[PDB]
Design a binder for this molecule. Structure first.
Ligand SMILES: [Cl-]
Ligand SMILES: [Cl-]
Ligand SMILES: [Cl-]
Length: 163
């Protein structure tokens, strides 16, 4: 465990993380994809061997000894708001189980279903609150990665609110 388990946010490429493992915002088929998934494919392509897994699940594949946790959020273009919310919550619960099983002291994590799976909606709060629900009972240092300056400020404020 971390000595004083924390949440932090950084506005940078998750492929350049400084944590002991990474969560990929994966597609169900283990394809290179776009956005976070394509950056992860370029950095850790060996981790895409048999990485296909259903929506609402996470599957870890090693790149050398570096764990890549493939977490499959729902595409809100295809799911109802209700079913999509349930699968997004479930994907983060499966990430918490994998982080625990691996025994890592830190994890790099993107906000699932906030990009091309967002169905065109701002899901910062929705996705972050499900991340907290899952990861609060873990003792890994969690470092959340984003690309937008306004998102960085809002994620930082949400972390500070609970402090
Ligand atoms: Cl960067
Ligand atoms: Cl996404
Ligand atoms: Cl972002």
């Amino acid at each position: 465990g971390a000595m004083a388990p924390s949440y932090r946010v950084k506005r940078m490429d998750i492929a350049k993380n400084d944590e002991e493992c990474v969560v990929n915002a994966a597609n169900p088929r283990g394809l290179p994809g776009d956005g976070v998934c394509k950056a992860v494919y370029k950095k850790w392509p060996e981790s895409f061997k048999n990485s296909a897994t259903p929506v609402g699940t996470a599957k870890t594949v090693m790149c050398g000894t570096y764990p890549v946790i493939h977490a499959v959020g729902p595409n809100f273009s295809n799911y109802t708001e209700s079913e999509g919310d349930r699968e997004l919550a479930a994907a983060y619960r499966e990430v918490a189980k994998e982080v625990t099983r691996l025994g890592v002291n830190s994890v790099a994590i993107p906000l699932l279903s906030t990009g091309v799976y967002s169905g065109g909606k701002d899901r910062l709060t929705q996705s972050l609150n499900h991340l907290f629900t899952a990861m609060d009972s873990t003792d890994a240092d969690v470092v959340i990665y984003c690309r937008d300056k306004e998102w960085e400020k809002k994620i930082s404020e949400a972390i500070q609110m609970r402090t």
